[PDB]
Amino acid sequence: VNLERSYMELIGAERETSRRNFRDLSLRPDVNLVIGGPKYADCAGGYCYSESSSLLSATRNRFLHWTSYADTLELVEISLD
Amino acid sequence: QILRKGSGRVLDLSWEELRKDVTLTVENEIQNAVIDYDVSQEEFRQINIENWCKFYTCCLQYQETLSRPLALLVHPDTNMVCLLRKGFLSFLAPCSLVEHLYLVPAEHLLTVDESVISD
Amino acid sequence: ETVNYNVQLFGSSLPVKVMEALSNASADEPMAACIHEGGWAWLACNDRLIIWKISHSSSAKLMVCKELPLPLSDSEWSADLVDICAQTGDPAAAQSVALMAATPEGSSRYWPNILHEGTYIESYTEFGSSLCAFVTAVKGNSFILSSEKNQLVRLTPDASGKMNQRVLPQGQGMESTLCSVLWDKGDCFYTLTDSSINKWDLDDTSESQVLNWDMSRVLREYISDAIWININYLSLNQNCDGLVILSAAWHPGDNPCQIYYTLVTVKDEGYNISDEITVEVTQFNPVFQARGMQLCQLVVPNFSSQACYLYTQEMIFACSTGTGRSTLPQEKIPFEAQGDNIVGAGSCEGWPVFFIRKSGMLTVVAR
């Protein structure tokens, strides 16, 4: 068991001068703007596909991540391949 | 965008274009700070420093805001670990043993399992 | 003299009791004064409170000065912990005026009428030892007592003689260290802490929390960019442009390290901050000495000329806010000379008022 004790942070530099041409989508649910509502802190999350570890799978090295702040959710699909 | 005081649609500028664009913007602020035709070379240098410093501190405040900490993604089957930051994605890769030992704090270096370094 | 201003006696001759307290007071003695917007002035001098109507007219039948006995404390009484309430908000003689006092530990003494100086009721809150607190008259004949740790307590006299009390919503107190508080028009009460501004909307018996703004996150770049970092937020006032915040900023490693005092104006519109922040850097720029010696307060007498008065104990700085378009000339006015000192400041009828150790009440008026 290579006890991999420490890790190092590697910045996946978004050096695309194209901001990932964020397909801006606006959802208007039938709800009124609450003035003075709780300010949530910014949060993020991610999801990995089934069979992403399978070398013949179409989901191989694919995953989803997102950031959410205020009223906005940014969703991204990444493939390392 | 803030130094220009202006609502211009930021074009997806190339980085070279962005560099030219910064240069011209700060030079114009320096030319505006030189009120007299008879500025000594020292007074001109001081004015140059003050204006670039002011632009730099402004980039810093935005970078601090974009750098704000999110969360962790760990893949169950592939063990891929990602650090979700506010402005970018980082990946955690395993550190080599040499780099681990150099970088660990002096207090934790005393609790390393010597069996992993060498038999 | 001063260059652009007349600095002269405001109102008529001071009450005999006020004159004795000043003539008797030594430079060892801490005097403090609350100059109230309703036209009454309260001098905290030793173990008594001397309260008088600011006498715009010289006439002796219109003269009111009452002296009240403070509740015992081991700490100095403060005119910050001392506040006036007027019947319907109208200042119309001694019966219209009710009075509260607080001690640093939280002992409260309330006079329903300044006419009846032996007639009061008592209560207690509770604070840590060392707490700098403020007492502020608010709507419905009630008061907010505000801790150094920013615990805010509503205090409401009942007709029984009881004093009702409750903590403000999200105002339990527990860095939330308190710098100042502001009571605005209609029913808005604001607190300025070392990290943030909080605002409550009041009625006669309750409060609703409106917002807390991380102004340290919002204004930090705008303050540092306007000068060049340690930032301390010290006082909060308002004018037509919106909220006016006094901030001190410094960098330890500056080759000469100076303290830059700024006036920051922001709009209070709804529950969120706007993108438009103005930062105006004042003439007041002393050498950094110690963080505990960073003392400076803010007066805004005129809501619609963009003019603010910074003050310490030895001098007044007439300063500008906003665009600076309607602002008065920037000038430093010294009150440091010959045992002289600025004991307090306020406004009467939109006029900048200073209470000075040598000369009493004085106005600062443009020439």
UniProtKB/TrEMBL annotation, chain C:
Species, as recorded: Xenopus laevis
Family classification: Belongs to the nucleoporin Nup133 family.
Function: Involved in poly(A)+ RNA transport. Involved in nephrogenesis.
Subcellular localization(s) per the UniProt record: Chromosome, Centromere, Kinetochore; Nucleus, Nuclear pore complex
Residues in Nucleoporin Nup133/Nup155-like N-terminal domain copies: 12-321
Protein name per its UniProtKB record: Nuclear pore complex protein Nup133
UniProt superkingdom: Eukaryota
Lineage per the UniProt record: Eukaryota, Metazoa, Chordata, Craniata, Vertebrata
Subunit structure as annotated in this protein's UniProt entry: Forms part of the Nup160 subcomplex in the nuclear pore which is composed of NUP160, NUP133, NUP107 and Nup96. This complex plays a role in RNA export and in tethering Nup98 and NUP153 to the nucleus.
Residues of the full protein shown: 69 to 466 of 1140
